[PDB]
Design a protein around this ligand. Structure first.
Ligand code: PCD
Ligand code: PCD
Ligand code: FES
Ligand code: FES
Ligand code: FES
Ligand code: FES
Lengths: 797, 155, 797, 156
């Protein structure tokens, strides 16, 4: 019966069905473009046709005279409000509407307000703009050249930025971590050494639902309400208040249902600011919803890292040192989402799952005539890059030593007894058990049989296909929080939760995070359910409304379970401590004479004497025990003591068609360990989604630019997104290594599948060519690009 | 403007429409049937899929005016008297949705595909759902959702 | 800069303009009938044409066939849900839809749901109902006769009710307080003894906006949302939850802008229950908005007390004892709003502002064929009746002893030094200073000159008008709260407040009360402004939404300032203590080296070292000092230690036309003392409204029934409401005697003008006839009634 | 059968089709969402529904919408010009002439017209001139002050 009562809760560990499904499966979800307000007008944006050039003149008359058009605003209308530029999370400034010149193609130059989106589109076509083209900067290396054109004329004469000194006009910053002296010394004396250059191409999160907002400033009440596709509504509110002068309490930002974010919706885009301004000016609602081409072309991109990795080791394979140098392309304006003190995110986590004694990494940011971004698409703040770098280097080292790729990892892994482990870069890994997981994966796929099949195939020079085996053993770092080192525009990276129990036993809870499909409305309810003995089904959770939810930092970097999940458990526990106190008063015994059993406090010894949470809730409203306030609720803001470090072990087997360059994923096995699991069903869905993004990135995605800086393949015509046919069947597995410092031992996990799968795909592809001396092949592993390599290494046909 | 009469979810709708009005906007803006979504301008995503005269069609590449005398079914019309359709139940039971943006289109497609092929193999399902993109699920649970609906429809 | 900084806050004591006005003066308020939802249908009610009778048959077919009508429901459709009867705040039950019989004219018999209100009204007329008339009961005394018809056949066989044993089938309860034996002993031997019967007429609160709601059950999400004219939305949510089976967390009740409540909107009316049920059945929104005739006829009435007062005294006017007996007319079902332990409210406060050593009161409630109610119209839970009884009795005593009416009061007043004073009934009056306040009023209106003028007119037999001087010195009891003593349906009568300070310094605040026009959105902000040094203009307050506001008991009995006002100050002080802790950390000094000066914490001895609330707010979000959670907010549930006891001295001069019987109010002076005053401008408005209601009750309002039970004058055709022409110019005054136990010393005051002015008017009219031996005249004092008295006493023309 | 009519409300043409029995108050509130005007009775006493029709103060609950085809109707929503409150709205605000706000839109529309009929009203004239509007909250005292305020502002 105690087990029956626990089961009935549908709390921690259960694979319960989602509470939010009902509305979505019936078309009753509420996304930004579903909103219609009285007197709502529509906005469209006139975008730059060229990548770089001065603005001679903008013709507004033809558009203005067009029936149905209410206004055409340019940067000149934004100047009095000091809004033609806006601060970015990276400490730089970004143009809202191009003023003296355009820095990237598709950049926002002007806006039009019309009766609807149809007339609005027509108005944009009627707005003519004259430009004087300037030479375009596309390659980061060419950008640092002495004679390179000045992209940021607004930064002229400056010698420093928000992240240190600047050595050139197109140089943004240089950041490093680790011991350079020690590392240099190791490499100088190391017996075995390897070094590889690799490009992590620029790709785009491309959420199915694009960015948008319905901005409504009410001149009567003097306040602003903005429904927006934001992954951080509370900071947006704080920023919007600052930039507009409207007192914060009078600004209400609400993230309704969002059709996927994937890091694309963390920052503030020029479209939002313009809509807000237009609404303030016209005194009525203004809706802005971008098209797919605008989303890919101008919203936050991911990656674009040019990396030079080096590994020092001994002949038996033990890694002695790690040295990395990177050139980062941040586009025209540095709007890279990151905690204020990390211009390159947590890239210094590149020591991986290995006990490397010495290490150093240096990252150099550079401006180019491209759209801003860098941190998005499940990157965990440059962790995607760090893992790709280390895993690729380990593979190169293994190939040079003719050492098995799994064996070199097992030998270098941080051991279970070394946790909490402090790396050469300073991170304190919370817990792990990499060895156990590796063995589990290797046995499941029969690794030795795989290697033997591969050996038998390579032996036959007439085999029509190449067999590749990729293996990645990674360590993630998620839960951006310690306010001491992590902050967004000055706000510490904590999070919160408020829970209120009603007189009849059910409850409502609000957090500072904001789901975009990851199931918080179900999972958050489960955490609280186990903490209070109230079925998750009646614990109603909400997020996204700054006027009702406790202040939080939103959801990105898989911080929800680590940061908010902790605040949820702690807020529930405050309520539990009061409930024990009330139960003791009702049972006329002392608190210490009580035992909590699933959903009730029972007197030690006598089982018949007990009080449920329902009984306690009513008592709290009926008559509070002496010294206590009526009610049963709690609030908690959690400033995390450390990050959470989930891990994984992925293996991919691929077969490459030698006649066409086509790569077919034969099998993919993914083991993730994110500690205590809240809902296995929901975790599985996150993994499936992340592995699919991984496949898309490694095998088909890219954002090429021609010599004139025009973005090629910025629509679904060429920008790769796999369908059910291209997506392989995923095999998942797991282990449970709890985070010691977390209230419920739960680590984040949503980005792990993306971070780890990308290098697993490259590993498998390169491994297919390893026997002919191939150490690396840059993504995407397109049939076109792979065929090119087949031809280079005489393996075609 | 052309006056048309479209049967949407069993109810006749006589409206005056501009020829250039895409069916997706007519449904979302004029009728407030906001289940159908927009995810692209090139006709790839399928988040706008609705059933028109017995067939799955991407409403973003069809004009509202062409629907004069047509029978259109949107996700809001799937449930019968509040009882979920097998495809809605399958997606729910098998966790075939996350952000829910591609869901209405996926459901409308699955609704017709299961009539085109009642006993589909996994390969046939993946191929039969090729016109619909999803960024969240990785498709695996969607295949299971459709399989669940197939079993319930022949029950 | 100190005095200026405090002034800029516009906090405590400031007559700052209202924050609410902006929307109301531009028609942007949001009242129940302004609400329009997708698929919303309209509901109208088929009402009883007779006062008492059996329901033979209801005809639904003609109405159902009518186009636009979706459904016609009766008690039969409610039975399966156990909703044909509903529990009331008085512990009795009330019919939602007449089942076997009707208990009062205009009672709810059936409901129709249609496309709009026009079709719905037509549908009501189409529904034919056949009845079997039964003998009516309209007089309380006739109701208790042996042969009197059985009204409540549903409780046949019950010998006890919710408030003790029941002696007759039409007898509801008998309640008493004070020392019976001691009181009887004093009266048995006292040298001076007076007795007086008086009727406190049944009147109606008649708020300009009638009752209504928009119920919306969403079958997709499974939750209920209903916008309603409720003065206690949280209590309604709990009750609706339990009666419907829908988990409370999935029930959202929201009181939007309410066009006046005046106690009329505290309870749940069958109309609300029906709309909710119809919404659940139809799976869509249902709107119900009653017409004026329905409001006056079926919603909560006020008074209807038949009272017999007695006073025992010595020849110098010193009161020795008080004995009271009352027969209460509660209508068909007892739905009288009151804490569960007080079926006669706080009537035992009838000892008034006088030190009476022995007293006893007894109230007997009885059933009659009329609408439920009793407590409403600014009564503070029968205080109106209590004050009227004692003040009329004191006048009667003064007239028998031929003693001045002001003098006899100054003789019996509780002395200032006697506070906190415990009355003969057990109340502990918090504070007071009646003598000082009385002297102020007497001098202000030149009382002796008024008496001199009155003496002159009385001398001339041919003076065309009678002069009457009325004086009332009363003590109120407001702030229903001590949970051990007061509860609404089991819920302790506490209240709450939650304040959240934003990173930039402004804030949001929500309380468990709900304004209906008394200015909470302005005043509440002022309390917080002074406590935290944040201008009230940027402290946004909201009430009414059960999903966002902390649980409270609502607004009635002038409880907001006493209970919520306390919760607000304490919640703010919780934030202020944390702000100090933070300021000390920033200033690197000990907490008590800090001084609070208006809006900042400064270092003692060093004015240059300080931190403002804005500085602190930012620090709370940026980097919390060790051992503190990030953020800056608090919530507080206040269970009051005692009620609040404001007082007042009211004087009115009237001139009665001997030829027509029409009374003209020459002057009305009102002094109120509600302790610390939050906003004088707002207080003055509450006084004007209250005094006007009093004039309405004493001079023109009534709800007469004919022998058949038909309610006469139930529309504005005859139900009296004064216009600007009839309303006299009010003169207001005040003294400040704070409540010692209250966090800011503020007492409630809103009901004072209503409670005190009524007996002041009667006192003036009766005093006009005093010279011919008139001791009392029953209200209303209309020209017609006053003329009948002029005629009866040979004073006519 | 519904009659097609065009009524000018706040200077904007409102083309609609309504049954002849449609009271002007419901037309404004239900058809145009101009929910400022309110309903407080069914006997024509309260004046909460007062709007300005063709230059005169009229209780819209006792006038047919169909009798307004071509008329000039003014509601509280149209008093403010370019955001600046009309003297009448400013008067009610500055003098605390409103509490619950229900009778307010009617009071404002009546005061707007009254001040044109009588630019310099005495208190008695104000009380009498506003006599068709009932208020449950204020006691009227501040309302006469509000009107006096507006009367003064219009002359300056
Ligand atoms: N241990 C554990 C963990 C976790 N979980 C679950 O799972 C989920 C998730 O979680 P996490 O991991 O914590 O995460 P989040 O925070 O929530 O999320 C976020 C992520 O998520 C992902 N995925 C996804 N999905 C979906 N559907 N949608 C989206 O949008 C998205 N996005 C993406 C990204 S990109 Mo960034 O932003 O670049 O940084 S970061 C990210 C939730 O429900 C939870 O509860 C569990 O159960 N258990
Ligand atoms: N000391 C002091 C006190 C007070 N105050 C203010 O004044 C007001 C008021 O308050 P009170 O006194 O506390 O009260 P309340 O609670 O708020 O209220 C209630 C009342 O209120 C009156 N008035 C009025 N008004 C209006 N406008 N509306 C309304 O509705 C009404 N209602 C009525 C009644 S009837 Mo019962 O329910 O039979 O019991 S109760 C009653 C507010 O704002 C407050 O804050 C100040 O300032 N100070
Ligand atoms: S919106 Fe993408 S196919 Fe229709
Ligand atoms: S569930 Fe989000 S795109 Fe399919
Ligand atoms: S609603 Fe009362 S006069 Fe018009
Ligand atoms: S302000 Fe409420 S009726 Fe006038």
């Amino acid at each position: 019966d105690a087990e029956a009562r626990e089961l009935a809760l549908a709390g921690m560990g259960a694979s319960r069905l989602r509470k939010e499904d009902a509305r979505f499966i019936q078309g009753k979800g509420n996304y930004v473009d579903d909103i219609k307000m009285p007197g709502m007008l529509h906005m469209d944006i006139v975008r730059a046709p060229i990548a770089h050039g001065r603005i001679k003149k903008i013709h507004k008359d033809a558009a203005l005279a067009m029936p149905g058009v209410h206004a055409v605003l340019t940067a000149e209308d934004l100047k009095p409000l000091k809004l033609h530029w806006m601060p970015t999370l990276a400490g730089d400034v970004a143009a809202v509407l191009a003023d003296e010149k355009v820095h990237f193609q598709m950049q926002e130059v002007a806006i039009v307000i019309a009766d609807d989106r149809y007339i609005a589109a027509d108005a944009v076509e009627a707005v003519k703009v004259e430009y004087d083209e300037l030479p375009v900067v596309i390659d980061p290396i060419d950008a640092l050249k002495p004679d390179a054109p000045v992209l940021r004329e607004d930064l002229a004469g400056k010698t420093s930025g928000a992240h240190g000194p600047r050595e050139h006009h197109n140089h943004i910053f240089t950041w490093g971590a680790g011991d350079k002296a020690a590392t240099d010394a190791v490499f100088a004396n190391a017996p075995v050494t390897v070094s590889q250059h690799m490009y992590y191409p620029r790709v785009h999160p491309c959420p199915l639902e694009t960015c948008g907002c319905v901005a409504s400033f009410d001149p009567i009440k003097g306040d602003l309400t903005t429904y927006i596709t934001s992954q951080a509504p509370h900071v947006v509110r704080t920023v919007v208040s600052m930039l507009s002068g409207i007192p914060e309490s009078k600004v209400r930002i609400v993230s309704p249902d969002i059709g996927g974010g994937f890091g694309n919706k963390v920052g503030i885009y020029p479209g939002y600011v313009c809509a807000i301004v237009a609404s303030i000016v016209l005194g009525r609602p203004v809706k802005w919803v971008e098209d797919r081409v605008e989303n890919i072309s101008t919203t936050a991109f991911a990656r674009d890292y040019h990396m030079d990795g080096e590994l020092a080791a001994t002949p038996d394979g033990k890694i002695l040192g790690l040295r990395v140098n990177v050139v980062a392309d941040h586009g025209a304006f540095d709007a890279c989402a990151d905690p204020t003190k990390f211009p390159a995110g947590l890239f210094h986590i590149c020591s991986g799952s290995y006990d490397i004694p010495r290490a150093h990494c240096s990252v150099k940011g550079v401006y180019t005539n491209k759209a801003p971004g860098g941190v998005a698409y499940r990157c965990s703040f440059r962790v995607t890059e760090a893992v790709y770098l280390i895993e690729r280097m380990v593979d190169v080292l293994a190939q040079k030593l003719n050492m098995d790729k799994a064996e070199i990892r097992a030998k270098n892994f941080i051991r279970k007894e070394q946790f909490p482990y402090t790396t050469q870069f300073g991170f304190e890994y919370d817990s792990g058990d990499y060895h156990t997981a590796l063995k589990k994966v290797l046995d499941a796929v029969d690794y030795p049989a795989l290697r033997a099949e591969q050996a038998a195939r390579r032996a036959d020079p007439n085999s029509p296909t190449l067999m590749g085996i990729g293996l990645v053993t990674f360590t993630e770092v998620v839960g951006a929080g310690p306010s001491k080192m992590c902050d967004i525009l000055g706000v510490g990276m904590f999070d919160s939760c408020e829970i209120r129990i009603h007189p009849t036993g059910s409850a409502i809870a609000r957090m500072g995070t904001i789901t975009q499909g990851q199931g918080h409305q179900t999972t958050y309810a489960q955490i609280i359910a186990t903490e209070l003995g109230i079925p998750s089904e009646v614990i109603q959770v909400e997020e996204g409304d700054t006027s009702t939810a406790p202040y939080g930092l939103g959801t990105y970097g898989s911080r929800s379970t680590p940061v908010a999940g902790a605040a949820i458990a702690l807020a529930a526990r405050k309520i539990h401590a009061k409930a024990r106190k009330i139960a003791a008063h009702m049972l006329e015994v002392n608190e210490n004479d009580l035992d909590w059993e699933v959903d009730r406090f029972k007197v030690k010894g006598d089982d018949s004497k007990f009080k449920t949470m329902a009984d306690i809730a009513w008592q709290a409203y009926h008559q509070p025990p002496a010294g206590l306030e009526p009610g049963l609720e709690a609030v908690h803001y959690y400033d995390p003591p450390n990050f959470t470090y989930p891990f994984g072990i992925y293996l991919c087997v691929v077969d490459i068609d030698r006649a066409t360059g086509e790569t077919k994923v034969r099998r993919f096995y993914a083991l993730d360990d994110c500690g205590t699991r809240i809902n296995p069903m929901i975790i599985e869905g996150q993994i499936h989604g992340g592995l699919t993004e991984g496949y898309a990135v490694a095998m088909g995605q890219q954002m090429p630019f021609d010599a004139q800086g025009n973005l090629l393949g910025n629509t679904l015509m060429d920008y790769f997104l796999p369908t059910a046919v291209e997506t392989p069947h995923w095999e998942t597995d797991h282990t449970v290594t709890p985070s010691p410092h977390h209230p419920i031992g739960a680590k984040g996990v949503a980005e792990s599948p993306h971070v780890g799968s990308i290098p697993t795909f490259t590993a498998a592809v390169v491994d297919a060519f390893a026997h002919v001396g191939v150490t690396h092949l840059d993504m995407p592993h397109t049939s076109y690009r792979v065929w090119k390599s087949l031809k280079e290494h005489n393996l075609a046909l | 403007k052309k006056i048309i009469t479209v049967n949407v979810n069993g109810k006749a709708q006589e409206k005056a429409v501009e020829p250039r009005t895409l069916l997706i906007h007519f449904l979302r803006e004029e009728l407030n049937l906001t289940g159908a979504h927009i995810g692209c301008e090139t006709s790839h995503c399928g988040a706008c899929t609705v059933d028109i005269d017995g067939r799955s069609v991407k409403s973003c590449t069809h004009l509202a005016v062409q629907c004069d005398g047509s029978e259109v079914l949107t996700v809001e019309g799937l449930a019968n008297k509040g009882v979920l359709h097998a495809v809605q139940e399958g997606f729910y039971k098998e966790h075939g949705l996350q952000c829910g943006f591609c869901t209405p289109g996926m459901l409308m497609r699955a609704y017709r595909f299961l009539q085109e092929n009642p006993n589909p193999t996994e390969a046939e399902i993946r191929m039969g759902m090729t016109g619909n993109l999803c960024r969240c699920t990785g498709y695996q649970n969607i295949v299971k959702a459709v399989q669940y609906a197939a079993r319930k429809l022949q029950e």
